[PDB]
Design a protein around this ligand. Structure first.
Ligand SMILES: Nc1ncnc2c1ncn2[C@@H]1O[C@H](COP(=O)(O)OP(=O)(O)O)[C@@H](O)[C@H]1O
Ligand SMILES: [Mg+2]
Lengths: 141, 105, 277, 52, 104, 53, 71
C-alpha cells in the first residue's frame, strides 16, 4: 500500500461514481506517467463500469444499442485505455500500464464489451474455467 | 427485502449479534424492482430488467456484511430463469454470493 | 433463425440418447458374448499344441481370411485389420505365390476390394445376424476347402479385454502339402504319435487340418464379434460425449440468441413508443 | 487488372483489383491490422505512386 | 474459428469473395484451382458434424480422402507474414501467383 | 373482408339460406390494420402488430 | 443496351431517389406493358429500397415497427 492508490466505487455507490472512478484512477496514475515515473493501473471489472454507464445512459432516455448498451460505450473505454501510454523522451519517458479486467459469462469471448476491449487493449490474458476447476491456477488459456 | 434488512440491522448494529437474513427468492426482489422501474417509465436494459439492476441489487446486498458491531449473513433462495446462469438477474446475483448450497432431489 | 438452433438442439439431444442406448446395447451384447468366447477359446489349444504355429511358411497357394464386422459403427476395427492384412499379404508374398483373399463381414468386402481388387475371391456376410455356430464356420471352412491352398491365414481381433483387442494372424497348414513338410526336422516331429485312425496318417491329417480350420475360424469370428461389440461400446461413448459437448455449446448459443431476441424486441417496442410519446 | 499481394489465400480465392475497393472483415483480434500491415509491406513498396 | 486453429491469416475461404475471380479475367486454370479448393473445403464443411459425432473412422473412402486433402489445403492457405515475424520469429514469405496456383 | 361478410350476412339473415364464405388470406386483415395503426397513434404491441390485434 | 433501360439510384444518391427508383423503372417499363410489347423489369436489391424507405420514414418521425421498418 506504500505504492498503491485504491479507488473504490463499490456496488452500493451511485452509477456516475462507478462510471467516473476509472477516470479518477487513471488521472491519479497519469500523475506518475506525466512526471517521468512509471505507473501500473488495474481497472478491475470494466464490465461493471460499462453497466454503470448503461444505467446512466438508459436513465437519460438515450437509445440503446447492442445488448442495450449506448453507442458510445466503445468511446467510454477507448477514452480511458488510450491514456495508458509509454511517453517519449521529450515528455519525460514516463509510462502507464493498464490491466483492464473483463468478466465473460460462459466463456463468451464474443460479447459486446468483451470484443470492445479486446479491440482496444494490446494483449490479452484469457483465463479459462475448465483449466481452473482442474486445479491449474493461474488458469491461463 | 429492505424491511428484513432493517430488522436485521437493528440486531447487528444495536444488539451486536450474528444475524441470519433469509431473503426468499432474491429473483423476485429483482423482478419487483423491474416492475417498479417499468411503472416509472424508465427504459428497460438488457433482457428486460431495469437499467438500475446491479445498483438495486447492490443497495440490497451491500448492507449484508460484517460491521465492527456484528454481522448479517444472508441465505438467499436463488431462482435461475430459463435455466440460464448468464441471464442478468442471476449473473448479477452471483456476483454478491459467497457460497452456494445446492439442495437436489 | 432462433428456431434453427432450437431444432438443432432437439436433433443433437436425441442423438445423445440414441448413441447411449446403442452403447448399452453393445455392452449387453458384449456381456452375453464374452462367456461364449471364453468357452470357445479352449479348443484352439490342442491344434496349436500338436500342429505348432508356422505363419511364415513358403506356401505356393495361400488363403487369407480377414474377419471383419457387418455393421459399421465399430470405430476403427475393420480398418485396422485391413492394415494388418496389407502388412501380411506383403509379408508372405516374396517369391511368387498365389493368394486368395476372403472376407467375413460386409466391412471386409467393402474394404479389401479397395487395395486388393483381383486376388479377392469370396465374400461371406450376415454371419452375426442371429449367432455364430460351429456348423456355420464349418460351411465357411468348406467353401475355403473348395479352394486347395497350401496354407490358410486368418486375420481377426482377439478379445483380450474391453479396451485391448490384439489383431491375430492364425495359420493352418494344409495336410500333406505343407504340414508334414514343416515338421520334417531331422526325421519328423509327428512320428512320435501312434495314429489310431481307420486309415493312414495322410487322411487323419486331412481331417485334422479341416477340423483345425473350422475351430480356428469359429473362434476367430467369435473373438472378432465380441471385440466388435466392445469397440462399438467404446465408440458409442465417444459419440455420446461429443453429442453432449455439442449440445452444451448449442445450449449456450441458444441462450445468447434468446437474450438477444428479448432485448431486440424490447428495443423495437421502446423506440416505437418513444416516437409517439 | 489483378493486384498481386503475395498472400496465398488472397491471391488464390479472392484476388484483389488494381484500382478496386477491398474490404477486410473480422472482429476483435482476428488479424485485420496485421493483414493490412502485410498488404502495406507487400503492395505499397511495389507500387510507385503515393499512399494515404 | 480459423484463428483459433492457428491458421494465419485467418481468412474464411468460403466467405471471402472477389469480382476478379472470373475466368475471363484471371485465366482458366487459376479460376479452376480456386473453385476446386473451394469445393473441397465446402465438402469438408458439410462433414464437420458427422466427424464430430461418429468420428473420423466411420466415413467413406472418398470422404476420408477429401477430408485429408482439405486439411492439407487448410494449412497450406496459411502463411508466415513478414510483419508478423517480430512476435513469431518465423520469417515471412512472399509467394508468387504462379507458385501458389501450381502448388494448389 | 367486412364487405364480403356483409354480402354473405344479407344472404344468411334476410333470405335465410346456407351461405359459403371463402376468405382468401384473412392474415391480410390483421396485416392491413397493422399498416395503419402506427399512424393512428397506437404504440406498438409485440412482434410488430397493433395493440388491438 | 438497345433493348435495355438502366435506372440506377446508387449508394451516394439520396434516400428518396433510392426509394423512388423501382417505381420510376416500373413506370418506364409500363410503356412497353401498356402498348402491347413485353417488358422485363429487374429490381435489383429491393431490400436496399426498403432500407432507404426506412431511413426516409424515420427521419420524417413516423413511428417504427419490426426491425425499425415502417408499418
Ligand atoms: N499473420 C499472423 N501471424 C501470426 N499471428 C497473427 C497474424 N495475424 C494476426 N495475428 C494475431 O492477432 C493479434 C492481433 O490481431 P490484430 O491485427 O490486432 O486484429 P484487430 O486489428 O482486428 O484487433 C496479434 O497479436 C497476433 O497474435
Ligand atoms: Mg486493429
Amino acid at each position: 500500500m506504500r505504492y498503491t492508490i485504491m479507488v473504490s466505487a463499490t456496488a452500493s455507490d451511485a452509477a456516475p461514481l462507478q462510471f467516473l472512478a476509472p477516470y479518477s484512477g487513471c488521472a491519479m496514475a497519469e500523475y506518475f506517467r506525466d512526471t517521468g515515473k512509471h505507473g501500473l493501473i488495474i481497472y478491475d471489472d470494466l464490465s461493471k463500469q460499462s453497466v454503470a454507464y448503461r444505467q446512466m445512459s438508459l436513465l437519460l432516455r438515450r437509445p440503446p444499442g447492442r445488448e442495450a448498451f449506448p453507442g458510445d460505450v466503445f468511446y467510454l473505454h477507448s477514452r480511458l485505455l488510450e491514456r495508458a501510454a509509454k511517453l517519449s523522451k521529450e515528455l519525460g519517458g514516463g509510462s502507464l500500464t493498464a490491466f483492464p479486467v473483463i468478466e465473460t459469462q460462459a466463456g463468451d469471448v464474443s460479447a459486446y464489451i468483451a470484443t470492445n476491449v479486446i479491440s482496444i487493449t494490446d494483449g490479452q490474458i484469457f483465463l479459462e474455467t475448465e483449466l481452473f476447476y482442474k486445479g491449474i491456477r493461474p488458469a491461463l488459456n | 427485502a429492505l424491511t428484513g434488512l432493517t430488522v436485521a440491522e437493528y440486531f447487528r448494529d444495536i444488539e451486536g449479534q450474528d444475524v441470519l437474513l433469509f431473503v426468499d427468492n432474491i429473483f423476485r426482489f429483482t423482478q419487483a424492482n423491474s416492475e417498479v422501474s417499468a411503472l416509472l417509465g424508465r427504459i428497460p436494459s438488457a433482457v428486460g430488467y431495469q437499467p438500475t439492476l446491479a445498483t438495486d441489487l447492490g443497495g440490497l446486498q451491500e448492507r449484508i456484511t460484517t460491521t465492527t458491531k456484528g454481522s448479517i449473513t444472508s441465505v438467499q433462495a436463488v431462482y435461475v430463469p430459463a435455466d440460464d446462469l448468464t441471464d442478468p438477474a442471476p449473473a448479477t446475483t452471483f456476483a454478491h454470493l459467497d457460497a452456494t448450497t445446492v439442495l437436489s432431489r | 433463425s432462433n428456431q434453427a438452433v432450437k431444432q438443432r438442439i432437439r436433433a443433437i439431444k436425441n442423438i445423445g440418447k440414441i448413441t447411449k442406448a446403442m452403447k448399452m446395447v453393445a455392452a449387453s451384447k458384449m456381456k452375453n458374448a464374452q462367456i461364449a468366447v471364453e468357452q470357445s477359446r479352449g479348443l484352439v489349444d490342442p491344434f496349436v499344441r500338436l500342429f505348432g504355429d508356422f505363419p511364415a511358411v513358403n506356401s505356393n497357394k495361400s488363403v487369407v481370411v480377414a474377419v471383419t464386422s457387418d455393421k459399421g459403427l465399430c470405430g476403427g476395427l475393420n480398418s485396422n485389420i485391413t492394415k494388418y492384412t496389407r502388412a501380411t499379404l506383403a509379408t508372405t508374398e516374396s517369391e511368387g505365390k498365389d493368394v486368395v483373399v476372403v472376407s467375413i463381414g460386409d466391412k471386409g468386402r467393402s474394404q479389401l476390394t479397395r487395395i486388393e481388387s483381383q486376388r479377392y475371391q469370396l465374400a461371406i456376410a450376415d454371419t452375426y445376424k442371429v449367432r455364430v455356430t460351429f456348423g456355420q464356420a464349418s460351411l465357411i471352412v468348406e467353401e475355403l476347402i473348395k479352394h486347395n491352398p497350401q496354407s490358410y491365414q486368418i486375420l481377426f481381433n482377439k478379445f483380450r479385454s474391453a479396451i485391448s483387442f490384439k489383431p491375430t494372424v492364425a495359420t493352418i497348414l494344409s495336410p500333406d502339402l505343407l504340414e508334414k513338410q514343416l515338421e520334417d526336422v531331422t526325421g519328423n516331429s509327428l512320428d512320435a504319435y501312434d495314429i489310431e485312425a481307420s486309415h493312414e496318417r495322410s487322411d487323419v491329417l486331412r481331417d485334422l487340418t479341416e477340423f483345425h480350420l473350422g475351430v480356428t475360424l469359429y473362434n476367430a469370428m467369435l473373438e472378432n464379434n465380441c471385440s466388435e461389440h466392445a469397440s462399438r461400446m467404446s465408440a458409442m461413448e465417444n459419440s455420446t460425449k461429443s453429442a453432449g459437448e455439442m449440445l452444451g455449446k448449442l445450449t449456450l448459443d441458444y441462450n445468447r440468441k434468446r437474450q438477444a431476441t428479448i432485448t431486440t424486441e424490447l428495443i423495437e417496442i421502446i423506440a416505437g413508443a418513444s416516437a409517439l410519446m | 487488372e489483378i493486384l498481386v499481394t503475395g498472400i496465398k489465400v488472397v491471391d488464390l480465392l479472392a484476388p484483389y483489383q488494381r484500382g478496386g475497393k477491398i474490404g477486410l472483415f473480422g472482429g476483435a483480434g482476428v488479424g485485420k491490422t496485421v493483414l493490412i500491415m502485410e498488404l502495406i509491406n507487400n503492395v505499397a513498396k511495389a507500387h510507385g505512386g503515393f499512399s494515404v | 474459428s480459423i484463428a483459433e486453429l492457428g491458421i494465419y491469416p485467418a481468412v474464411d475461404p468460403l466467405d471471402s469473395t472477389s469480382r476478379m475471380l472470373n475466368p475471363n479475367v484471371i485465366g482458366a486454370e487459376h479460376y479452376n484451382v480456386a473453385r476446386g479448393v473451394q469445393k473441397v473445403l465446402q465438402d469438408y464443411k458439410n462433414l464437420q458434424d458427422i466427424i464430430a459425432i461418429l468420428g473420423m473412422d466411420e466415413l467413406s473412402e472418398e470422404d476420408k480422402l477429401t477430408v485429408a486433402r482439405a486439411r492439407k489445403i487448410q494449412r497450406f492457405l496459411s502463411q508466415p507474414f513478414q510483419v508478423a515475424e517480430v512476435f513469431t520469429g518465423t520469417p515471412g514469405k512472399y509467394v508468387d501467383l504462379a507458385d501458389t496456383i501450381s502448388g494448389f
